[PDB]
Amino acid sequence: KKKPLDGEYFTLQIRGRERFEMFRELNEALELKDAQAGKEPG
Amino acid sequence: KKKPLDGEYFTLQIRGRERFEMFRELNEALELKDAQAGKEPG
Amino acid sequence: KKKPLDGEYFTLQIRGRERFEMFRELNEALELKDAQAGKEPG
Amino acid sequence: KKKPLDGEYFTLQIRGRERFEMFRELNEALELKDAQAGKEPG
To answer: How far is CA B24 from the centre of its chain?
Structure first.
């Protein structure tokens, strides 16, 4: 498929695997919002 | 000092510089509470 | 439509107007994923 | 003691008890850093 070039691309070292999964959820959250930006104004 | 056994160490790609600073903030947030887990709750 | 059984309904006092808008953003974030829990993951 | 001028005070309806405990955790997180804003960064 090859996705287009999105915004920049940084990284973050999250210590502790427990809190790691927690941050991952927040990442996907904002990710879906960005995809809803190109969606209808509704 | 600091911590004997360090937890795992993963990483996360944060697209977008604006949202990046947002996640980094939460990172130090949880890290602070971790240092408070040393002395019992008071 | 929307959702048959609504989950519980609590509340939270957010001190500071600046940080307030920050939490509200995460609120709608999780709410969006909840609506996606209807159709299987794809 | 504590803080002279308290910031504003709003509220937020968190649907779902599971996600509720999640937001509450981040609440105390930012509150802790606020108390550290007293002494310069070190």
So the answer is: 8
Tell me the C-alpha distance between C2 and A29, whole Å.
Answer: 20
Q: The domain that contains A31 carries what CATH number?
A: 4.10.170.10
Contacts of A36 in chain C (CB under 8 A): 32
Query: CA A30 to CA A25: how far, in whole Å?
Result: 9
Distance CA A9, CA B20 (A): 9
Beta-carbon contacts of D17 under 8 Å, excluding residues fewer than 6 positions away, are C7, C8, C10
Q: Residue B39 is part of which domain span?
A: 1-42
Neighbouring chains to B with at least 3 Cβ pairs closer than 8 Å: A, D
Which A positions 1-40 lie with beta carbon below 8 A of chain B? 6-20, 22-24, 26-27, 30-31, 34
- What are the two backbone dihedrals, phi and then psi, of residue D27, each rounded to the nearest 5 degrees? -60, -60
Domains identified in chain B, total number: 1
